[PDB]
Amino acid sequence: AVVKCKPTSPGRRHVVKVVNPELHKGKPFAPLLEKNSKSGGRNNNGRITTRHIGGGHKQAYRIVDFKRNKDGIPAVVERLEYDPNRSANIALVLYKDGERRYILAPKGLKAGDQIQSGVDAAIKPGNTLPMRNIPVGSTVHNVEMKPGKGGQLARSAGTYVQIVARDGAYVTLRLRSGEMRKVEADCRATLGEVGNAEHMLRVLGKAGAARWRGVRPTVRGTAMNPVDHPHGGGEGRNFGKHPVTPWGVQTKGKKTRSNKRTDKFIVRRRS
Amino acid sequence: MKRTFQPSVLKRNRSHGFRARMATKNGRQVLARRRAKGRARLTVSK
RNA sequence: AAUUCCUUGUCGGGUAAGUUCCGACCUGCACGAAUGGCGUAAUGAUGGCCAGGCUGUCUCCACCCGAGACUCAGUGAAAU
RNA sequence: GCUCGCCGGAAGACCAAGGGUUCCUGUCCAACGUUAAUCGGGGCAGGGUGAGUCGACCCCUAAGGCGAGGCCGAAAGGCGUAGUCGAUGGGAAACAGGUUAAUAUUCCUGUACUUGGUGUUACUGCGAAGGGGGGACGGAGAAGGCUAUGUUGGCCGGGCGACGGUUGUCCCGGUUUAAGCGUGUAGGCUGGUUUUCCAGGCAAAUCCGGAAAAUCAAGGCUGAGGCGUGAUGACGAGGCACUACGGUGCUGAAGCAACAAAUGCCCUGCUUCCAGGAAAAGCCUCUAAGCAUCAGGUAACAUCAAAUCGUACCCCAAACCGACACAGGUGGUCAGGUAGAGAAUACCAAGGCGCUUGAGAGAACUCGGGUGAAGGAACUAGGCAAAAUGGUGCCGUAACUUCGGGAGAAGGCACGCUGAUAUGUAGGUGAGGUCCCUCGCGGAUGGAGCUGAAAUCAGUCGAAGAUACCAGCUGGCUGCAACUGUUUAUUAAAAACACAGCACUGUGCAAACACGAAAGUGGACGUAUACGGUGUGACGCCUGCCCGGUGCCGGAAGGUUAAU
RNA sequence: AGGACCGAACCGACUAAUGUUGAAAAAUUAGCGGAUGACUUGUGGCUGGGGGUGAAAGGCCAAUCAAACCGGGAGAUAGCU
RNA sequence: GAGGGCGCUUACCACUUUGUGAUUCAUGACUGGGGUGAAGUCGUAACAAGGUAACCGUAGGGGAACCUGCGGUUGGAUCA
């Protein structure tokens, strides 16, 4: 929408909530749900391996077809609904012979829309094709980085990607983060923009409302002693040293990329 | 008030219980030192 | 002043007297604008002060009641 | 025994993990037990808790653990797929009248029900460690239909009384009851049939999923009570004969209706909210294999076993834990009457207990209570401690404010009981007659029966009605942290800590990063409106100077400079 | 509708009180604070000693703690009581 | 005796006490801006192309007259 809240206890009157009345408030499609038990930021034998993650509420995971299995099959968008595993909302797609899958949502909110992959398939956004058949400047929706590997990038509310060059067998993406890189033109693009787009207008309201969103507190490293977190210093309120990670390394401005596999496909990177 | 001992056999027989002690490196060694001490029982769970 | 040593500074408000408080003066041993600088609705089993209320806190305690104490028959420790 | 005092949402009764004969009876004197023991929970000899259904196991699964093949590590050992364990959760099936010194859904009796087997009959395609369905899940709230229970009638049985009155300005006890099966109602939810086509469900499929034309709707699904039915029974005031007595044990009357409400049922209903709230097997279907010598299925009748371990008792405790029989800990079940909003609190049932060292005395002093002259914080570093206030309905209510708040600001008024309006109003319920009948355990309409405020008015008593229990320190100036929340368990609950938010920054997904050299796993199966690291901490108004130091990012030539 | 009004259970541990060879190796009482919430909690599993776990106090880890408990090096070493 | 007063009493009641909130004149440590004299100090802001044309509006900035930025004007001189 988005809309303001009203106060029941001091204070909430200026808080904002997203509200999307065009999404179906009913039940998720059951053959696609898994238990997906929480791990509390603790690995197999640990001890914490990611901090601040902890608590529920209990939530099932919905299996999405990001890999887009099978090709050229006619379908229809039967339902648009919200998904709490993610933020861009979901689409329930029904293939002509009764096969149902969860798929990443369009910008659209109108249901019953008929969609198919192909190049003799209607030119509209939501009909997926290989990037060898499209012009420069196009917004591509969510894409695969290797042919048949499935959808990565621009999956968050209202996010997209643009193709800014093409030559021979390869196409160049421009990322909204400030990155510019190549992928193979055999890779599939769905065209346009992803659903929701309003999520960044929300402002939660009260500290407790994060505790059912998988959040727990942890005390400031600068407020404890250096045996515990390395950012701790005697008497506090005047550190005299650079700010650091829980392992005594820089926490402002220090770059950490060391992949060395995917980098020769890149033209420009994030500042 | 509350005691540190709170009785339950499900928990005490997976805790100090013989079957995993007889299936773990150092638990097997408790049993070998107890055969050498000559105890009437090797278990402590009954 | 949650910051100023000599120093219990000064004046207005104030108290029977205030090294109290509030406001003013700048007359702050190196307060000073992202650890911000200053106000500030809401919150306070909240420090510094005032009034209004109420009192065994006090002037100063007087009596009344139980259960110990005291005394008796039995059980019967420790530091040293 | 009798009388007394106490608990009675417990100080009663049942229970899971807990322990395991401490149960029931006789007996003991030696040891033990806060005194003394004639007593035992301590000793000795006897008596006893029977199951397809209730518990656990047989079968299933979460978090997790273990693990052939496959991998890591001197090695022990560790991961991890097939596989297999795993309860705090899912698994077809029960009721309660008798019989005793302990127990019984188990024995006795009556009846119902589950899985498989073996027969008997009719018809017959059934079926997997595979597909589809189911299992299947959160938080809150208000209606509709009800119910155990209580309250009061009718019904059954009785009293009319000692002290003043009680054959009528009424009182005592009874009025109980089932799993299951039926009707399927109430409540709730909801479109079928026919012909027919099809790129889906790892193979296959008449199941499920996708779609058209035709036609018609008043049918379907799900399920409390009521009533039926288990029951022409059991139980039950009573009835009857007898050991001259421990009970005996056959037989039996009334056994109906309203009203108020669940902590219970329809209800794994409805509406609503946003945190969208386990899985699998048994179970229901579809098909592969297998087979017709059948096996299996549907319906009906007969009929066999159903093991394994459990079952006593203490149980919010001298049978569980506290060194001890110690003012302690303590998951679950249950909810009578008066008053009350209530599981507060005050008095009492049913039921239980009398705190297992006591007896005198009536010293201060001391713990804990009651009342208090004439003043008042004069006390104390601190109005500390104590005290006042206080209920619950209505009126009234400032500065400041971000106009939400502040606000229970401040302040004021009223309070019993009786009677009447109305021999009981208003609220709720509801029968007869009548009316309407997608037809009836129904609806509309109106008030026989029931339940029944509160207010006003007028009396009435005392100085006194919040008549007991119940139950706020308020306002003014100022500091500080925005707030609710957290913390040194055991001298600090705060101004520190946390937070929506705000800022700075890392990160392109085999992300950054963690622990491990790795094996893996978590981040995350998320994807820059996402995730990681750090600081700062509502909001409003604003926010000067500095690159010498210390770290980062970019520039990329050159310098110091390694192995080579 | 509520990290809303009030208030038992329950939980907290701010003030008062009793206790100190305790009834209790901090417990028991009253007031106070919270009381569908960032609340409170039963059973299991996971994490451990230079190691865990912390809305943090260098708090706590089976009565023991800024390195618990148990077994060894080891009758360690001590210009010292 | 009665009738009526005086007395008593129900009603209203001047006078009169408090709480809580407004209102109004004057006054208050101190302080901002206004007025003033005097060949002050510092700069020279408008009048002329007024010394960098000026003015209307407006945000920021300096010790200040004002300066800078942007929109609006040309009531303004110079080839004009």
Side-chain angles (χ1 to χ4, degrees):
Chain A
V2 303
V3 298
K4 302 176 207 73
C5 304
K6 70 200 74 192
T8 53
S9 80
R12 179 171 179 77
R13 194 173 73 111
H14 294 299
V15 176
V16 177
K17 55 189 286 176
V18 183
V19 180
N20 188 351
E22 221 68 63
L23 298 180
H24 193 314
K25 294 177 179 175
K27 297 180 186 294
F29 190 68
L32 302 176
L33 269 65
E34 292 298 332
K35 192 183 193 291
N36 193 252
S37 305
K38 276 78 176 70
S39 305
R42 297 140 207 256
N43 75 339
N44 187 33
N45 65 313
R47 319 182 204 202
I48 301 177
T49 49
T50 304
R51 299 148 68 247
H52 318 112
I53 170 61
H57 196 84
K58 186 173 187 186
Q59 183 184 106
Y61 175 78
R62 304 99 167 280
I63 300 170
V64 184
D65 189 17
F66 295 119
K67 185 159 172 167
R68 294 178 176 258
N69 179 30
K70 295 178 286 180
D71 193 88
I73 315 307
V76 71
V77 181
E78 185 174 66
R79 197 183 289 206
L80 298 178
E81 65 179 311
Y82 199 82
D83 183 330
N85 311 151
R86 68 197 75 261
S87 66
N89 82 247
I90 207 69
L92 186 71
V93 62
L94 168 62
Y95 297 94
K96 194 169 176 271
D97 294 64
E99 185 174 279
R100 280 179 178 90
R101 300 293 174 248
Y102 274 125
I103 209 167
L104 188 65
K107 177 165 185 295
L109 292 170
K110 183 175 170 184
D113 186 52
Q114 284 173 328
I115 56 170
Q116 63 179 116
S117 74
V119 296
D120 58 82
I123 196 162
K124 58 183 282 188
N127 282 2
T128 305
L129 83 173
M131 292 185 280
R132 55 158 169 277
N133 280 101
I134 58 174
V136 179
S138 305
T139 51
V140 292
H141 195 272
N142 169 239
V143 297
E144 66 189 358
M145 306 302 160
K146 289 178 182 170
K149 194 183 182 188
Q152 290 179 346
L153 179 65
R155 313 209 315 202
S156 320
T159 65
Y160 63 91
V161 206
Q162 195 185 8
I163 51 160
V164 297
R166 204 189 83 226
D167 193 279
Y170 298 92
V171 66
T172 314
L173 297 166
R174 182 193 289 161
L175 290 80
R176 298 279 282 167
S177 55
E179 192 175 81
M180 184 175 162
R181 77 191 203 243
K182 282 178 177 174
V183 295
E184 191 177 345
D186 201 64
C187 300
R188 291 173 297 164
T190 302
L191 312 178
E193 192 179 290
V194 83
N196 182 354
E198 297 179 301
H199 219 55
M200 71 183 183
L201 305 178
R202 93 195 183 287
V203 301
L204 189 57
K206 72 161 171 169
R211 307 304 305 281
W212 66 82
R213 296 176 154 70
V215 191
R216 78 183 306 298
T218 290
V219 174
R220 261 157 50 261
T222 204
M224 63 180 67
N225 293 358
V227 295
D228 302 323
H229 191 301
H231 202 331
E235 200 166 287
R237 295 186 176 213
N238 197 88
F239 191 37
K241 303 191 291 176
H242 267 272
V244 294
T245 67
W247 303 269
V249 185
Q250 286 83 344
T251 204
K252 281 188 173 189
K254 184 177 169 62
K255 296 183 184 183
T256 71
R257 181 178 172 83
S258 304
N259 174 267
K260 308 189 176 193
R261 294 184 287 258
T262 66
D263 223 278
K264 300 164 180 172
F265 318 133
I266 310 178
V267 188
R268 204 64 54 190
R269 292 191 67 251
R270 174 179 49 75
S271 305
Chain B
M1 223 301 177
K2 185 177 185 175
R3 299 293 289 179
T4 68
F5 176 84
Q6 297 295 329
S8 180
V9 78
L10 173 63
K11 191 156 166 183
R12 192 175 174 186
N13 201 29
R14 290 204 295 233
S15 304
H16 330 85
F18 176 91
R19 193 154 175 97
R21 282 179 166 194
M22 190 49 168
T24 47
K25 184 192 172 283
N26 306 327
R28 291 188 306 226
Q29 289 174 352
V30 176
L31 306 175
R33 294 190 309 262
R34 286 178 179 240
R35 287 190 288 98
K37 194 177 188 193
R39 289 191 184 274
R41 305 195 305 174
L42 308 181
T43 184
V44 292
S45 309
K46 283 185 180 181

